[PDB]
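Dear all,

This email documents one entry for the complex benchmark we are building for the journal club exercise. For each entry we list the sequence lines for every component of the assembly. Then comes the predicted three-dimensional structure of the complex as a token string, followed by one or two observations. Please use this as the template for your own entries, and keep the labels exactly as they appear.
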Amino acid sequence: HGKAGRKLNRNSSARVALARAQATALLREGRIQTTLTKAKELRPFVEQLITTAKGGDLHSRRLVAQDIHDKDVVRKVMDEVAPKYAERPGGYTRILRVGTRRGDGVTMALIEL
Amino acid sequence: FRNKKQRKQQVKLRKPGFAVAKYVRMSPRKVRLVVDVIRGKSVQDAEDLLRFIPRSASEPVAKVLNSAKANALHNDEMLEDRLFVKEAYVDAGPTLKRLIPRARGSANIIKKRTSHITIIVAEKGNK
Amino acid sequence: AKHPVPKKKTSKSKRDMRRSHHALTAPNLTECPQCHGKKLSHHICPNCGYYDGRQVLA
Amino acid sequence: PRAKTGIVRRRRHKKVLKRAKGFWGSRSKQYRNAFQTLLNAATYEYRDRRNKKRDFRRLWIQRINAGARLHGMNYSTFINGLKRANIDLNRKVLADIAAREPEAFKALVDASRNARQ
RNA sequence: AAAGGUGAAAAGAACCCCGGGAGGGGAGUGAAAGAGAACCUGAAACCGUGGACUUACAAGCAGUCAUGGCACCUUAUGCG
RNA sequence: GCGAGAGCUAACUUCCGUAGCCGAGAGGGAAACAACCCAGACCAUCAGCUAAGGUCCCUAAAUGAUCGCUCAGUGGUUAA
RNA sequence: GUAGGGGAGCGUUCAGUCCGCGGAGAAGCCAUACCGGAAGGAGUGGUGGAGCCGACUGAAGUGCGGAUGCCGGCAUGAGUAACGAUAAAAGAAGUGAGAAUCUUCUUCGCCGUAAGGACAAGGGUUCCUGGGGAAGGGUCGUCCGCCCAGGGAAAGUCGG
Ligand SMILES: [Mg+2]
Ligand SMILES: [Mg+2]
């Protein structure tokens, strides 16, 4: 079989540097269009990140800072966005799919906060 | 009648709802795929299906289809909302033979084909 | 050499019995509820940018 | 003086090429093959006349006794009978008489038994 | 090495349509574009569109002879 | 095939004699099958009599007639 | 009826001669159920756009499926295998007829006795600026080492 549960298409570090790279852009710009699948990878990861930020203690900040290497973006998620999602049962990030693309026929999409 | 020679002059010979992109740098066989979903329908649909169909042959077929339309309409004073792809097809124009290197000295020729995409629009109607 | 290699040219026919399966399926376009242009089910209307409200920029 | 083959060969070819009709694929579009098909074609053509003669008398003999036996005779017998009566001497059209005119055919049938035993 | 050919004469296509272009459709010139500049004729292989008769229990050098069905009938309705 | 040698009176073996056919020979027959058997194709014919071989059905023609033989499927893979 | 010998003829070009034919239309091409014992011939229609049948005689680079033949064109394999080091890439923003593939920003990753820098030889303008967008670039390209135009190179002591 192969009844596992995750995705790659890169080695072990690339797949981690991406999910971190998108995690950050998503949080730094509230929205980003990306390959449909990549957004799918991103979504859960990021939601987790918003939930770690959603604690306010230094510990929770320091943890987020492990997957958000930009001081400015951490402050945002830490002080602006995490506090805002206070009352929603971690469930906000939505993906919209757009049209297929020209250079490679790949269907792009939107993942927005 | 008269005889051939007089005919040629009494007449000019025209092509209703007809356009044709000659020498499109694609493979006939490749373009045909797209030209095939569009054959025989509401020139509207053709406009529509092309916008979405993923093959990169779609643009050219698009362009020819809206040129054959801009004719049926103009040079033919046709009623666009009865227009429908009467006929469409793809023929091969010249072929751009190009040489490519291969392993151990030998060489090869890549055939970069080309196509003449022509499409003919015509008013439909039942009766 | 080029080890396996074909025994005979294939009929124009045979060669076609083959391809009897390469016909594209035309998209199943829907008509956008607002600007009414046709769209792709579950995606945003490239002509108005809606998906109930207006998501993509004009 | 030089002396091309021009037009002289195209024609020789179209001649054969056009003989091949419902000749399947290549056999009806390529000279060489189409032509070649027509050699075997010779073989059949010629030998099939000296032969449909063989085939037809067979169709005749088959019917002539599916009527012969329709009364109680059978080709073998039946035939020698009409024979026994130099009088009778069709054999050719006999089948047909046996296929279309039952009224008649019977006649000849019984006619033989009446020249037989 | 290969490589020729608009038209009598450039009169070689003003202006309008679709296209970024290429290309094409009209208009106009010309006897002719059923000569337009990837321009005398333009065979064949080879690709394709439409139509007619066919084909999804079948073992096939691919035809040939015979018969029936369907279609069509300018040297051709009576033979094809 | 017939007559010999050679060879294990082996070989679609080899070498000579001699007849026939294939080679340069179609047609019928022997399932298929150069040479075995009957026969030598000037062309046409939905005509007729025969050869060798055959006459339950697959294919044309007596599942014919009379007196017997074997029960083995002998028929339709050999001997002391 | 194979090797072979003998006989009678068909066709192709060129040449002499005869009868001619043609822009209301030649040759060539294309279609055809006619003609002749064959090679072959004719009629009709379509195409074509200028030279051309028939007859007698003469001369021939005179007749093709084969030669792993020669040149050219086009097929099959088949939309198959490949797209040339496993040093990754992401987002935003911009330009544009059109961009994964160009430009900008911000990150990521790879080399760092090098995948940095300076010459030599060799190559020549490939350099810079503005344009370009056929073909080349194993894919896009609005970009390029590609195309077009203009500009650029400065030595008494560095090499000769
Ligand atoms: Mg013994
Ligand atoms: Mg050859």
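Observations: The helical segments of chain B are 4-10, 28-37, 43-52, 58-65, 69-72. Chain B has five helices and five strands.
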